[PDB]
Amino acid sequence: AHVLTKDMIQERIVALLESFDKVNDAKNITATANLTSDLGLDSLDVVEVVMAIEEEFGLEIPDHDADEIKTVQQAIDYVSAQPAA
Amino acid sequence: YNAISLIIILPCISWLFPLFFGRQLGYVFVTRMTSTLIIITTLITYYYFYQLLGNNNPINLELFNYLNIDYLDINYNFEIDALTITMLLAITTISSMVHIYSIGYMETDPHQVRFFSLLSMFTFWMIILVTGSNYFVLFVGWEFIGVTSYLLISFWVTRLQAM
Amino acid sequence: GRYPFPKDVISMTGGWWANPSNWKLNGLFATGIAVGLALWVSTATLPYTRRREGITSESDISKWNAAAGVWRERHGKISTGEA
Amino acid sequence: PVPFSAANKKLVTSMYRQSLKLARNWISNRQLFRQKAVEIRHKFDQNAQISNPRLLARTLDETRAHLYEFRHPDPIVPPSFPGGTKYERNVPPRMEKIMQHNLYEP
Amino acid sequence: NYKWNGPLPRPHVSAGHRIATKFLGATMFFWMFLRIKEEYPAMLGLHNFYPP
Amino acid sequence: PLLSQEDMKKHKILLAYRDRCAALLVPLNECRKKNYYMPWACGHERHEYEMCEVADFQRRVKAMDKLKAEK
Amino acid sequence: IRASFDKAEEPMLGDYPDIDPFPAQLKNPYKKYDDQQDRRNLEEPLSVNDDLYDMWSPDRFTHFKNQDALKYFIGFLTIFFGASYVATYFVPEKAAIPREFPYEGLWKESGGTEKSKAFFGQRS
Amino acid sequence: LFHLLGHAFFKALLFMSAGSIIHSILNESQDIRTYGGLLSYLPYTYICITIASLSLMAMPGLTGYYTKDIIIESTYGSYSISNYVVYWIAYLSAVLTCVYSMKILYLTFYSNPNNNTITYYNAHESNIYITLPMFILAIFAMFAGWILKDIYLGVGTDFVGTHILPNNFSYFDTEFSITQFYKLLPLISAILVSILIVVLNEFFAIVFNLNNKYINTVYSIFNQKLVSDQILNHFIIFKGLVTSGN
Amino acid sequence: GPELTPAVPFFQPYVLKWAGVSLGLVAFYQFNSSYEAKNGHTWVETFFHPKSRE
Amino acid sequence: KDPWARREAWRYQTNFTRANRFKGAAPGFGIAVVAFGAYLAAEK
Ligand SMILES: CCCCCCCCCCCC(=O)OC[C@H](COP(=O)(O)OCC[N+](C)(C)C)OC(=O)CCCCCCCCCCC
How far is CA H210 from CA B52, D27, D66, E49, H219, in A? Predict the structure, then answer.
């Protein structure tokens, strides 16, 4: 069938963030970058980004776990924690 | 070679043989075997339909007695007439196609022996339903297709919503 | 794909992805039994097969209806709607 | 009811996510979904700085009412999740040893 | 899946599937043309059976 | 010509088909028996039966016309 | 506590916890439970009518209230049937006479008898 | 009987084609809102589902035509006067049919992609075990009705020997008494509505994707099965369990 | 090609038991009917010795 | 106005243009016009 790898998840998230226009800079997006701090993403903007992530990997993030992810590495480890994605 | 007897008895084998011999055969053989039996049934049905359009003289198959109490005499009687042959055309054609389709569609599923036995079970009891010559045989088929529907809709047993 | 399953669980249906190593030999046995059963059934049920029409003659049908009329005249039997 | 607090943020963010989910559920066409999504973000932006308690509580109550008026009969869920068509299909068995119950009989 | 958020390549589809689609669509359109030609009057509604 | 009652019974016509036109129905069904009811066959017999039915339906529409005119 | 039938049992408990019942189907399914499928945790108290609120109970529908759904269902049936009945009035009349049959409606062919021709017998 | 036999074939084809579509998605989603560009990727499943839909819509020269249309016309030709109302009901159903068929045809194959990018990369056709039955049933759904119309709907066919009371039998009246308007209106309406639905989806999405509160309400009514399932579950089944407790 | 599970003997004890009993019953039925055609009565009837009605 | 307007471009580009999205919606139709014209010729 089809199986994703940690690096595939990372590459997809990085391209995703690169596509976002509200970001500060594209070159500054790291695996451990903070969207709130480094990318300067607003309160609602990080929500838009989590929604984009779930629309991209086909999963459903609860409210309590959505607001917990603050870094890109946090996003990647969450998306790799989920079996069907 | 008796068309009516084969039309009844071959889906019965495609139903029961997987339940008797599934652990010994495996789903590869079971899928191919059930599909082949249903195909042969469908072919026999098409030939019978051709002849019946030639000569509308239905075959009857009259077997042992069910009840012979005071005035009520019920027998395991079957006939294939125009109405029945139209039903059987639909039933056997769609059943053979669904059997072939399921080889591919269910290839990953762990429980394929049970699934194919149940599809064949449904075909057999529906054939019984339409070929019976009295309302009792009709009812026998009527209740058994309900049982089979229960077993099929709940095929994925661990799923609450399916149950 | 697949996943582990308990090997002690014995089901008549074979359980999980049942594909025995000797399945082709077992299939030969199963098909032989199937052919034997189908042919025995087809032959044994042959004497109980008959066609629907042209099995009784017009003589029998006509005379049976005549006798029933005789029976209904011995008793006092008017017809349905006959009043 | 704070004009700007962690609880207020959590609430408004949950709600804005709800709005975007709702809009995706209701609008079939992708282009128009992007239109309405942009407009939702604008509406969420305009009332961002409300400070006094009465007005903020009122705006929150009225947006809650708006959302409840626009609830969808059946949201889109991915199949492997609770509301999904594949949820709990073919759940792999727990691997587990046979506990005996009788001295003489298995 | 080399390209992301980018234009997609033309799908690769088997030759047999393309041929089968050709045959199915051609037979369907041709059969419909045949039937329309053969049943134009009755199927459109003509030659009224009422006396004039 | 209207078929005999004995003829109607002998050819085992269905009751709803026992009309002034069943005389044509008999050959049509014989051909539909010889050929296996195939659509391309029995064209002449089929058309003759249809024309007889045309005449019957026309007579009935004129009957309804007269009945309408009385009112 | 909430429904009339759970309230009616209130005299029937002495020293059993009066639990306010919630339909298991409506518990959010992203929380974690000891039995995920049943959405229950171990040692959780049961309402006296727990069998009507667990996961195996009949499904509950949230989008409309039950009363409003009843309104809509009755209204759909009412408008459909009333419209059909009313339409029956504004109907065109047919153009051909219903057909007829020799032998006084083939009363003999449909069984029938001289003395009983109204029971069996066509339009003739 | 003829409509039963004809409907079986193309209904089986529709369901098998849907199964193919579903297996062509990694998620294996069944939501028509989650597909959207698949015409290029699955041309054969498209053609099978298309043939089945046009058979259902009783398009000319197809098996569904020879069953659906004549059943629709029988109601007008029926001797019972009031039965005229049924005509209109049936006709509305017919056009309603087109509306959903086109809706699944467009939303699956024409619209614009609504799934994420990896699904379109991995979207492929199915194996032969799936494909061959669809081909066979496609042939059936094109040819069976025409090749069998004489057996079941023939001017005096004696094959099904059911004893219809002569006063009741009206199959001749429903052919001779039918006018052009009624014999043609379901067909034209089907064609026009199918084109209408497609063009309004591709050009005026607002009319379908409004946000009126009232229209959303009536849509919600229809989406939840004319709330029947709630009505059954609360007023009969749940009430019955409460009574059993009592 | 799918995987292979361990070989399993076709004729289990249950196969032998149920097939043997069923086929033996059918064989007995046919033997009784043939013995009836020849002898005049079923061979099972011969073991029936009720008291007379009188 | 769209800050994800970059992310959505691929949904309206080459395989998903109005020209491409409706290409192959009538498979075999040209073969059908040729065959119908041919049969019209041969029938007479
Ligand atoms: C299993 C799928 C169906 C297979 C059918 C194959 C039939 C082949 C030969 C049939 C001969 C026949 O049935 O005869 C039946 C014979 C004599 O009947 P008869 O009056 O002489 O004729 C019948 C035809 N009439 C009437 C039209 C002329 O009495 C019996 O044996 C019944 C014995 C009952 C035994 C107890 C029931 C055991 C049930 C076991 C369930 C597992």
Answer: 57, 8, 16, 49, 11
Say whether J29 sits in a helix, a strand or coil: helix
Contact G21, G2 (CB under 8 A): yes
Question: How many folded domains does chain D comprise?
Answer: 1
CA F40/CA F36 separation, integer angstroms: 10
Sign of torsion, CA C28 C32 C38 C42? positive
Cα(B1) to ligand 1 centroid in Å equals 19
Count of the separate structural domains present in chain F: 1
Helix axes of A43-57 and D30-46: crossing angle, nearest 10 degrees: 160
Resolution, expressed in angstroms to one decimal: 2.4
Q: Is A39 helix (H, G, I), strand (E, B) or coil?
A: coil
User: Who contacts A71 (Cβ-Cβ below 8 Å, separation ≥6)?
Assistant: A32, A33, A34, A35
Looking at the DSSP bridge assignments, the partners of residue B62 are: B77
User: Are the C-beta atoms of B113 and B30 separated by less than 8 Å?
Assistant: yes
Question: What is the C-alpha to C-alpha distance for residues H231 and G70, in angstroms, rounded to an integer?
Answer: 7
How was this entry determined? cryo-EM
**What residue segments make up the domains of chain E, in order of their start?**
1-52
Taking the C-alpha atoms of residue B64 and residue H27, their distance in angstroms, rounded to an integer, is: 54
Q: Using a CB-CB distance cutoff of 8 angstroms, which residues of chain A are in contact with residue J4?
A: 19-21, 48, 52
Residues whose CB falls within 8 Å of the CB of residue H78, separated by 6 or more in sequence, listed in order: H86, H170, H174
Our answer on whether J and A touch (3+ beta-carbon pairs < 8 Å) is yes
For residue D57, the enclosing domain spans 1-106
Give the bridge partners for C20, in sequence order. I5
Using CA atoms, how far residue I54 sits from I48, I50, I51, in Å, is 17, 11, 8
The tally of CA atoms less than 13 A away on the side-chain side of residue B2 is 24
How many angstroms away from the CA of G74 is the closest CA of chain B?
A: 28
For residues H124 and H40, the answer to whether their CB atoms sit within 8 Å is no
Q: Is A42 a catalytic residue?
A: yes
Contact (CB, 8 A) for A35 and A52: no
Longest dimension (CA), chain E: 73
Find the CB nearest E31 among H117, H142, H183: H142
At a CB cut-off of 8 Å and minimum separation 6, what does H83 contact? H75, H76
| Subunit contact D34:J11, Cβ cutoff 8 A | no
Burial class (CB in 10 A: 0-12, 13-18, 19+), D28: buried
Chain H interface includes G67 (CB < 8 A): no
Is residue B44 within 8 Å of residue B156, measured between CB atoms? Answer: no
The alpha carbon of residue D1 and the mean position of all alpha carbons in its chain are separated, in whole angstroms, by: 21
Structural contact between residues B121 and B149, judged by C-beta atoms closer than 8 angstroms: no
The enclosing H or E element of C49 equals strand C49-51
Residue H178 with chain E: CB contacts under 8 Å = 45
Region of residue D74 (left: phi > 0; alpha: psi -120 to 50; beta: else): beta
Q: Is the dihedral of CA D67, D73, D78, D84 positive or negative?
A: positive
A58–H122 CB contact, under 8 Å = no
Distance from CA of H116 to the nearest CA of A (A): 5
Half-sphere exposure of E18 (CA within 13 A, CB side): 8
Report how many domains make up chain A: 1
Q: What's the CA-to-centroid distance between B4 and ligand 1, angstroms?
A: 16
Which positions ≥6 away from D11 have C-beta within 8 Å? D60
Nearest to J20 among H40, H46, H117 (CB): H40
- Residues from chain C that touch G115, judged by Cβ atoms under 8 A, are 78-79, 81-83
Order of all β-strands in the sheet with B59-69? B72-80, B59-69, C49-51
Residue G103 touches partner F, C-beta closer than 8 Å: yes
